Specification:
hypoxanthine phosphoribosyltransferase activity (chain B), Hypoxanthine-guanine phosphoribosyltransferase, putative (chain B), binds the ligand Nc1nc2c(ncn2CCN(/C=C/P(=O)(O)O)CCOCP(=O)(O)O)c(=O)[nH]1, 3 helices, homodimer, three-stranded antiparallel beta sheet, alpha/beta, PRTase-like (chain B), binds magnesium ion, five-stranded parallel beta sheet, Rossmann fold
Chain lengths: 209, 214
């Protein structure tokens, strides 16, 4: 468990390291990983028994269980979800749920999604527009057996369209957060904890990368 | 967390009691992997923390700038096999206090970089493995020609030097592997086993186990 405090200048510290950009801590690494570990069991319990189209043996007409032959299809949204997805699939492996990951940037190279169980792994749902558009696009272009969304952070106070993620690790207020995949022009993406950003830092790096 | 390698009643390799029927042997357990990544982050921090490169945060500045959050180390992560490696390493680099930003490239070039200001920057390629050396040889040449960065270096999780058909030497290597096909921790066969925490040598009987297109 990480120790959260304040340094001599009032900056947020976690495990003795100062974070001058942070207004406060939303969730430390150990809290995030506990939430994701429980979510991995939640995802395993929801999918381990399901069956979907057999593409390993196309000669088999029946529905096949979720195995290494026909794993769960996971769509990971770059770039904000790559660190979240990296830890989740390993926790899913701990829970014995076979899965494969392809990436989308808002494109995939997976093509046999029809009749499959597909799970989207996204960093955050705020207004809901990003995932509302993605689910509609995947459903119309692939028609999976099922399509669900797992987000690391949900902001239900920001929802302005009709979208609700089925699986949520953390619930946050309508504040701009950084760390553990979240960033300000890619800065702070590699931090192990999620912080509320100081508004003074929101426009700190305006130059294009 | 020290891992225990053994065999089950059927003769399959086990790591911490979990059976891996696809594995012929263990190249490196999770603790071995993360120990080398922790030491590599220190090596990378020491090699870059005092260097300077072009200031693109303040375009009105003419002097070279240190590596800061304003002008961080540019990391190019090669999809897909390097994404788990990259996710762990950049967090270890944060532990070492090395500011960095990550963009992704996919090559067979399928997905291009979105970063555009690499000229005169220190750029670090993060790749999962170097086998024949071709993929990285071509990628080093393309980035050098297209951008001319201040420095361009390659950090691989696994080096297989016994497989070289071209002359390529990555500057930083976490682990060395025998000239075998490995799976686990980013490495896969048709995307299977990518999420395993240990690197195994795959059994030859599993080489073409999943031929169907995903
Ligand atoms: N770092 C951070 N980003 C947030 C946050 N909320 C939304 N977003 C936007 C997340 N994403 C922006 C990343 P980009 O590739 O465009 O730079 C867009 C996804 O937004 C979620 P939604 O469509 O509003 O539900 C937040 O709290 N912290
Ligand atoms: N799973 C596995 N793949 C190997 C191996 N060696 C090369 N490769 C090819 C890896 N790469 C593609 C697989 P990924 O999904 O990571 O993008 C190709 C890069 O090959 C390295 P090189 O050009 O031969 O030096 C190996 O031992 N195990
Ligand atoms: Mg992002
Ligand atoms: Mg952003
Ligand atoms: Mg590769
Ligand atoms: Mg930093």
């Amino acid at each position: 468990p990480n120790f959260v405090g304040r340094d001599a200048d009032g900056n947020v510290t976690v495990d003795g390291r100062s974070y001058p950009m942070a207004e406060s801590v939303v969730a430390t690494e150990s809290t995030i990983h506990r939430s994701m570990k429980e979510m991995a069991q939640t995802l395993a319990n929801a999918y381990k028994t399901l069956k979907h189209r057999d593409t390993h043996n196309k000669g088999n007409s029946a529905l096949a269980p979720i195995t290494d032959e026909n794993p769960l299809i996971i769509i990971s949204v770059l770039k904000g979800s790559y660190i979240f997805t990296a830890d989740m699939v390993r926790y899913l492996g701990d829970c014995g749920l076979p899965n494969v990951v392809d990436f989308i940037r808002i494109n995939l190279r997976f093509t046999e999604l029809t009749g499959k169980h597909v799970l989207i792994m996204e960093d955050i749902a705020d207004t809901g527009r990003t995932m509302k558009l993605l689910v509609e696009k995947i459903r119309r272009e692939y028609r999976p057996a099922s399509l669900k969304v797992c987000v690391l952070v949900d902001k239900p106070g920001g929802r302005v369209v009709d979208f609700k993620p089925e699986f949520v690790c953390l619930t946050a207020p309508t504040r701009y957060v950084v760390g553990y995949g979240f960033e300000v022009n890619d800065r702070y993406r590699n931090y192990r904890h999620v912080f509320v950003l100081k508004p003074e830092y929101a426009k700190r790096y305006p130059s294009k990368l």
